[PDB]
Amino acid sequence: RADVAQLTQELGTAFFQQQQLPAAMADTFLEHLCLLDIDSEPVAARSTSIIATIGPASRSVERLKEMIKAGMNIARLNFSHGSHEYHAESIANVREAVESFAGSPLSYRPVAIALDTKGPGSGPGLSEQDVRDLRFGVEHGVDIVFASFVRKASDVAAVRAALGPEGHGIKIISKIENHEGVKRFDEILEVSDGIMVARGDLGIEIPAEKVFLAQKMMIGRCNLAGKPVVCATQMLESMITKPRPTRAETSDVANAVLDGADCIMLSGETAKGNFPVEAVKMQHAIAREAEAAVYHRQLFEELRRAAPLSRDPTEVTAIGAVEAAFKCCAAAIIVLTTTGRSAQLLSRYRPRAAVIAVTRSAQAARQVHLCRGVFPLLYREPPEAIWADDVDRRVQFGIESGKLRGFLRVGDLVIVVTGWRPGSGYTNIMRVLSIS
Amino acid sequence: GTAFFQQQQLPAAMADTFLEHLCLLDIDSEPVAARSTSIIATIGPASRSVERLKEMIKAGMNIARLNFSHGSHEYHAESIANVREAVESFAGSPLSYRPVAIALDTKGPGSGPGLSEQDVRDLRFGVEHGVDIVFASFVRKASDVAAVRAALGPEGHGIKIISKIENHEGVKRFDEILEVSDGIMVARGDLGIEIPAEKVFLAQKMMIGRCNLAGKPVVCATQMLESMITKPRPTRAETSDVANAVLDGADCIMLSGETAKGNFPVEAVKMQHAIAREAEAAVYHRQLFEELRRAAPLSRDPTEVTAIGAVEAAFKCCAAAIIVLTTTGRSAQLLSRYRPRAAVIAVTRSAQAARQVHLCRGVFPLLYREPPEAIWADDVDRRVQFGIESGKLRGFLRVGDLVIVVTGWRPGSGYTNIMRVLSIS
Amino acid sequence: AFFQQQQLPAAMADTFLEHLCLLDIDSEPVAARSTSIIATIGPASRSVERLKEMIKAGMNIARLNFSHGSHEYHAESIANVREAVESFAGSPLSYRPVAIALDTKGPGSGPGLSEQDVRDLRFGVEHGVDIVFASFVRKASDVAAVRAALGPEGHGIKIISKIENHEGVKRFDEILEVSDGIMVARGDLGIEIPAEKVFLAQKMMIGRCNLAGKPVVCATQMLESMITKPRPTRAETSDVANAVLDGADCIMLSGETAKGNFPVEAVKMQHAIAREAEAAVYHRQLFEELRRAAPLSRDPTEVTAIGAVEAAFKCCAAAIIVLTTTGRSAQLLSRYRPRAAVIAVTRSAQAARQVHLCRGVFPLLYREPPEAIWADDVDRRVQFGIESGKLRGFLRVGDLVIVVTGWRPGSGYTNIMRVLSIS
Amino acid sequence: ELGTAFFQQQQLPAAMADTFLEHLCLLDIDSEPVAARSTSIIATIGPASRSVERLKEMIKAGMNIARLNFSHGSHEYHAESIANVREAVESFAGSPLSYRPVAIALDTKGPGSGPGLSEQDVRDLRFGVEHGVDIVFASFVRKASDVAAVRAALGPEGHGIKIISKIENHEGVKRFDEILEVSDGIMVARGDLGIEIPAEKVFLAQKMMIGRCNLAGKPVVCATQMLESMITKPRPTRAETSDVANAVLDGADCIMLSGETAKGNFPVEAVKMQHAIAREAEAAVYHRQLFEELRRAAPLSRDPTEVTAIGAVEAAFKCCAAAIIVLTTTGRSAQLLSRYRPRAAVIAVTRSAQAARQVHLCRGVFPLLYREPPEAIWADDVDRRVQFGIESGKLRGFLRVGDLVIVVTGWRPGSGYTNIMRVLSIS
Ligand SMILES: O=P(O)(O)OC[C@H]1O[C@](O)(COP(=O)(O)O)[C@@H](O)[C@@H]1O
Ligand SMILES: O=P(O)(O)OC[C@H]1O[C@](O)(COP(=O)(O)O)[C@@H](O)[C@@H]1O
Ligand SMILES: O=P(O)(O)OC[C@H]1O[C@](O)(COP(=O)(O)O)[C@@H](O)[C@@H]1O
Ligand SMILES: O=P(O)(O)OC[C@H]1O[C@](O)(COP(=O)(O)O)[C@@H](O)[C@@H]1O
Ligand SMILES: [K+]
Ligand SMILES: [K+]
Ligand SMILES: [K+]
Ligand SMILES: [K+]
Ligand SMILES: [Mg+2]
């Protein structure tokens, strides 16, 4: 207790009874489980992003507005079904629903658009349909590609080549769907931006009883590499027909978050099901509960022990900022980022504190949804004449959005992460600030 | 030789952190050990046939659950007769005979504040028909367990009482309930309606952790393979749920509609068996054993002291099994609480203890039928040899394997105090 | 080559046992010596010429034992120490501050702070001593009497309570609470309690001081045989190494420097052993345990300190440069025992002297002209830390350093940590 | 059932701590040691400690191993020292409470230069075999071939003599692994080591060698200048008491006295001081981390003696066992228990007088020489030896009725079959 006694006197016992903080303070994983409390309410914003597949049940602008409000962060377009005209209309509807909230930039929630490819089929690699669909993606400015049936590093290179010179900024998330993809995982992760554990095909390609081993291994390896990992397929399957999920489905969603997944996905549940909005709301409710149940004490210790020494100032600042956030129970870590990289490096240490990422790049704001606990804020103001004042205005924008979004209150401590000069790659500063 | 350290997730077992353990999990590393998490199958119209029950026993069913929320006493007496006929059909080959427990799951208190009159009648029927376990519905406080125990009367003292936690009050009063119960059931069906659905996993993980700390059996129940009531293969969420219940530390996993009324009762049992085997090999024993040891208090009880020594010895040599002689099952339960990787082969003359020890993870009961040898030390050795011969026939043991043998210094329950390292010949 | 030195193979070990197995006599220490050396000034070490050699050998704190000698004698010792210290002031990038500590005679027959101690404490204030080593502290009220005897002009003097008997050990927690630090005074402790129990008292007190983040001094008979012999015994080198491994902030020399035949050699020996022992510290366990035990805090200096030490370990930072007025920001970094040297840039001459009490804090006294813009003044003090660090061998071009500063002037506002590449 | 007082003695509050830092913070000068002293004391025999009367006082003070330094004195001088040690030891053979085996160790002059074993070392090693010494402390061992030369010189009759390799220079430290592999144990010979390598590096060599020996399960001796000032002064310095305590905390199986007992004015007081400090330091060992690390670092084993030893040590910790009674012919089963550093005393019952003397090299092993004729029924002979261990334990203060003990035996007679651990209640 002496390690939390002064902070308990200052913040109160009510603060320390919420968000599974009694379980967080435990000295062993066993004691942590024993202290999990159904009466300990989650307080933090939901950190695991929700990917919802867009289809006939979730295509209308009106329905998409409800889905964004329910918690959808990434809209998935499954190119296994529908024409280019159909998907272009889905993209337009998503963009219309997203831009309907651009009224106030303080609450504007960016939504990424992901293109999920049909796949190689009987072919040994990049199909002609995938080449056409990937070209459509670049032309329509998609943020992410979920590349189907990635079996080796050369499959990812073929996807990158098909995106051409104009699609260099698009994130490639390799879908691991068969035995070869699992066995060649390391070479695939090395050349990918992230991974999707595509359990539908994986569960038919390898014995169904082995899928959890592949899922846990891939999530662990992605967490170690600091690259986003998506858990997908049949997470809330029964909700395609019923308004409430089974006990196995709620458990699966909670366990994907506890495993370390950055994102969780909905397929038939939102694309064609009877309750698309309810499915998004259910993933949101479970992820909030499960994130608070993460045993950060061991996770942070293990991420530090396993991660190699780094001479990169962004990485060095990120670990210092996460350590500082844990020391004071910081409400948030506000970070300025051009590409999303500084926010991704904070996310890899899994802080309890929300990572509020302030960026001018609309694409980076959408793409950072791939990183757990990163809350993107799109800054729209033109640059100030003095650079230091432009940095300060962006930090204040993060604070004001954080106050109005519920993340921050007067009296809270926040960690602010910035760099010494303009441009990407120069993050090197960490500040402890009292919110006024 | 060399292939041995490739199997049963041994590369992941040797890892220095839980994160690296996860990174080393291999879909090609085949499980070798026998499946340690017991399977409880609910009996109903889909699974009452004596011939279908024989297939369920072969598939891996260890405990037959009788749900007294449906059917009369006449119905449940027929279910018991059918289970006993199917189980006893294998008694002609003692080396492969698998005991099967019979559990009575009560209707519950309804709108009442405690033990119902129907529950009193059902509990007496349970004693009269010799059931091994009671799964007491809606246990909300310690007095509910005392009322169940009193309704079982003087003749039902040996029946195990597994308290079902199904509502907010049961979760909040968990410690006082566990203290007076033989074990717990995380009854997720009612729990998921009584508390928010998104909070059930917290209740399940807490209860399993607390039962593991207390060394008392814990059952994970309801909708684990729900889609298998009508489909031949489960969903990805269902296989994950079964695997995670085992990784959480559940001693038993259960099937309800999947075996009582569904079209795939045998396949549901086979699926739980296949998943549990994979998940048990994926347990990070290095941390689990260390934490169970650190949390367990010092003990002056020789059975408890021998059990921790035997489990430590089994991990040191990668023992294929710990062979234990037991009258009540207690010596096997105390070995099970330290979660050894080695199968705990429990040799007993008590048909009831043989059935009840299925509640304890990794305990493989063998019912010894022979009358005692005149020389007690020779009778103990004959039982150890029966454990070895059964283990060999069932694939648990081979010549060259090391086994830990746990026995006592005198006849009768409560005197376990010896651990021996034996090479299988 | 980098990873072969300063016991880095042993530092990477997964257990304390494997760390011991990987210790290498060929792995040379590269970091500057972090444990301060306290040398007792007496007939063998009073000359200005001798004191210059002692400062060069590694003496950081000059102890005046008021159990012997008059006020006139000690005033002359103080003047000689100050003359020797100030003779190196011509090179500001290499100047080493040296603290002056007054070790009291003690209560004797007990009851009441001695009238001799009242006079000696007033002498200390008048002569501007940095530290008081208060003899035979048995309870919190003894520290209060020492503080009261220092008066209004002595508020800034650090009180290091000497634990010398059973009562002091038993009432340790209440003593530490009101003291700036502790001295494990093994001479009297070894006569007051059984000789074979002193190591238990030493290890307990060092552990509790490390937990509290307060300085702890190991003292007496560390290199005893060096009073008459040019080389110490095997037990003496082991004792010095083990005091550093136990977690002592300072190590002391008494008769070895006050009256011995080899005072300079004794200082050189403590310096050589301490540097080897500091590299042999198993930081992986020490940092984790200190981090887990240090309470959660909303004080920005405490929050910045742990973030800075974590960042330093992540990049193998050559140093943590910190700006400090009172020494507090450097003390809060020192409590986490970084491998990186804590270079404390200060304008206060007294704070520069007193921070030698905290392990791994290298004080630099800032004497460069002031800048008109506060932001430029801070930057120049940071560049001074870099320049002094380069000259002294702490830093080289290409090294990474962690820089710790505040958002406004004055003490108590440290809240910034920056990762900086040298040149 | 143990009482409250039980958990306050032998640093049990510090033993229960969750971190090493918390363990240090909980060390208590008022928490009295209760266990018997486990670190053996080696005393060098010389003019100050040669008389039968002085040796009797040294045995009473705690001397377990008598060291004969063949760097000085003739074969006739050392034969008289050996006879005096044996006379002093056998003078207690009447009283079971006072009789204790004492090993005799021959410390060689060394190679000086040359390319192999010196002619003097060959003759001195032959003298050792002829006079039935238990241990050889081989001076200036630099490589594995130096150990093989000592092993060869122990002739056809002395293959059972333990070779403790003395590491005294840079080459010995650098070639440590190959030396330890072929040796029975190691001596950290700090006198020469402190002249051969920089004085400030000796502690690194000491801690490294003790750690590697602990990992290998082989005895390690800390030697030279431990209580140096006691050659002329009746009490040691603060650095000397610290050095003894830290050698025990480092993991040394034995501690040594050289000039302190060979020529000093206070030989008996030096032995008493080492006994007093070792008892305090053994209780201060952080067993929770030590056992966990020894467990994690030691490889998996299919040797039943090793498997039984770890099970027995785990069981001893679980019940706070007063002792682990082990039957051993060569000492190996006691050595394998000792490597896991139990807090419980390891009472080793043996018929071998040589094994009884030699097991003093292993920390926490209390040898009991058994001389009853063998029973016709082997199980009866085993039971009689187990009860001999219990009754000796009761007489010596290790055990009382109601205590729990762990008993380690094998399934058949002869060395190499240890495979049984039992939990017994003392009646
Ligand atoms: O995370 P990224 O892509 O490296 O961006 C971080 C960069 O953002 C900043 O904080 C602000 O940069 P800009 O003013 O160019 O937007 C830089 O100081 C820092 O290098
Ligand atoms: O586990 P339990 O019920 O305590 O039974 C263990 C008992 O079994 C035995 O091994 C054999 O006893 P029996 O010969 O009476 O079957 C005893 O020595 C021991 O006390
Ligand atoms: O360690 P201390 O005593 O709190 O001093 C730290 C202070 O030093 C500074 O870095 C510089 O302050 P000054 O300009 O007054 O010297 C402050 O920003 C900070 O509050
Ligand atoms: O430690 P060692 O030399 O292997 O001796 C252990 C041996 O002692 C015994 O316990 C008793 O053997 P003996 O009857 O031959 O003395 C054996 O069962 C065991 O193999
Ligand atoms: K697809
Ligand atoms: K029921
Ligand atoms: K004094
Ligand atoms: K010699
Ligand atoms: Mg697919």
Ligand SMILES: [Mg+2]
């Ligand atoms: Mg129910």
Ligand SMILES: [Mg+2]
């Ligand atoms: Mg004194």
Ligand SMILES: [Mg+2]
């Ligand atoms: Mg020598």
Ligand code: NA
């Ligand atoms: Na996110």
Ligand code: NA
């Ligand atoms: Na089972």
Ligand code: NA
């Ligand atoms: Na000993």
